Design a binder for this molecule. Structure first.
Ligand SMILES: *SCCNC(=O)C1CCN(C(=O)C(C)(C)Oc2ccc(Cl)cc2)CC1
Ligand SMILES: *SCCNC(=O)C1CCN(C(=O)C(C)(C)Oc2ccc(Cl)cc2)CC1
Ligand SMILES: [Cl-]
Ligand SMILES: [Cl-]
Ligand SMILES: [Mg+2]
Ligand SMILES: [Mg+2]
Ligand SMILES: [Mg+2]
Ligand SMILES: [Mg+2]
Ligand SMILES: [Mg+2]
Ligand SMILES: [Mg+2]
Lengths: 236, 8, 236, 8
């Protein structure tokens, strides 16, 4: 739509400017426009797409959590009926969040994943698919929640299978995937023991491969390993 | 809440 | 427009929820809707209107400053021609900022100021008018800049005249007006000596009236006095 | 940059 008249390179340039200006909604719109040009994305471009939408959905998730907590407190025993406004506004934010998730999933399905043949690209996109289904799961209820959870699980599992066959255990995309899948198990799937096992095995297999890395690669891998350890400390 | 992968 | 079907009280309630959720664009839309109901605003409601638009325009101002600095560096001696993208994107943000300022000024002109008869309300709105003209001045150039600067000055001056006749020197609206008018003099009007004089006189006349205040009133007045002192230290 | 009045 609105970015169809702008050059791909200009969209990428403006995404980078939007990032510097902390204008993440603009950044996401620019990167959506770039994806819709139909060409595969470079590593740097995949990162720009991810940063943009992560910041947009992250603000929405934070807002939804605030409103859901107010709503839950409004619905307790001996709370004053305050009318429909809290629910309405929580629903408004929820619907916007779902729309962002649907937009990202649509870009991945049309046609980023199917055109991604290298492991680094395909795993990145499958991880993203699991992440955006996970964000949908955070706000879902009931049987709808069940199917969304299964979709997140399936995307993460495909990404796991590829990453284990095609990437070293210290690869940051592989590590971040495993981190996020462990969060899925703990926070979404009610499988804390699976979460703990995955985080431990991931950490230990990365530790054993650190000796192969340059200083810069070591910094990235150890940063994610620290997040695995942080979660293990929270979970045990 | 558990920590997921941070942005760049 | 879009808020016409929602009750005034529900708009105010949702503005407060949006504030808690740090959803300031939503907050501003709710408060615009409340203003357009046509009734005067209470003190609390005036504060909600101000908080909402201050946070929206504040993010835009911060973004515009980042982009203007990149643009200025792009236009230096021995810089690579990078094309029209930085200017285009700075213009996009600028136009959105101007639109927000025009929206606020329109609410003040239709009809908040004319219906405000009490000094506390009228001064609040005239200060806001000066502020939003000042934000327009920050991005303006040339002769357009001259007329916008004059409009800011005129609004602030009317607010000053009323506040000096009708409010004590410690009143926080009077103090914040004087603070902002001093910023106008220093940062916009190229009148640093006027800025310094106004800040000093305001500080000293407030100091002399602090003995009349309760603990809570004292806290608010002294907070703004500290900002006057901070600026005086920066300016001298 | 000079400091103006902060929000609530
Ligand atoms: S090659 C694909 C694009 N690059 C990246 O995603 C990398 C960007 C920066 N970065 C990180 O911030 C940390 C170390 C947190 O790790 C990850 C970030 C994002 C993902 Cl998807 C995975 C790991 C390294 C990765
Ligand atoms: S009665 C009008 C609505 N209330 C206010 O504007 C007050 C809100 C809270 N507050 C402040 O945060 C400080 C102390 C910074 O002072 C001012 C804020 C905003 C303005 Cl317009 C003026 C002073 C007190 C004022
Ligand atoms: Cl709503
Ligand atoms: Cl643009
Ligand atoms: Mg082209
Ligand atoms: Mg009761
Ligand atoms: Mg819903
Ligand atoms: Mg009514
Ligand atoms: Mg050169
Ligand atoms: Mg312009």
């Amino acid at each position: 739509g609105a970015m169809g008249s702008m050059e791909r390179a200009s969209l990428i340039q403006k995404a980078k400017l939007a990032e510097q200006a902390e204008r993440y909604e603009d950044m996401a719109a620019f990167m959506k426009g770039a994806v819709e040009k139909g060409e595969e994305l470079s590593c740097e471009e995949r990162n720009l797409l991810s940063v943009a939408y992560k910041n947009v959905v992250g603000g929405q998730r934070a807002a939804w959590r605030v409103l859901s907590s107010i709503e839950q407190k409004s619905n307790e025993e001996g709370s004053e009926e305050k009318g429909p406004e809290v629910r309405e506004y929580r629903e408004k934010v929820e619907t916007e969040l779902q729309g962002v998730c649907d937009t990202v999933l649509g870009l991945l399905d049309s046609h980023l994943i199917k055109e991604a043949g290298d492991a680094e690209s395909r795993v990145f996109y499958l991880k993203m698919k699991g992440d955006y289904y996970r964000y949908l799961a955070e706000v879902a209820t009931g049987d709808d929640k069940k199917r969304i959870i299964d979709s997140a699980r399936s995307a993460y599992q495909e990404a796991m299978d590829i990453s284990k066959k095609e990437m070293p255990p210290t690869n940051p995309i592989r590590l971040g995937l495993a981190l996020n899948f462990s969060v899925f198990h703990y926070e979404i799937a009610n499988s804390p023991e699976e979460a703990i096992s995955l985080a431990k095995t991931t950490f230990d297999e990365a530790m054993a491969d650190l000796h192969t890395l340059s200083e810069d690669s070591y910094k990235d891998s150890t940063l994610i390993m620290q997040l695995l350890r942080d979660n293990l400390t929270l979970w045990t | 809440r558990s920590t997921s992968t941070p942005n760049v």
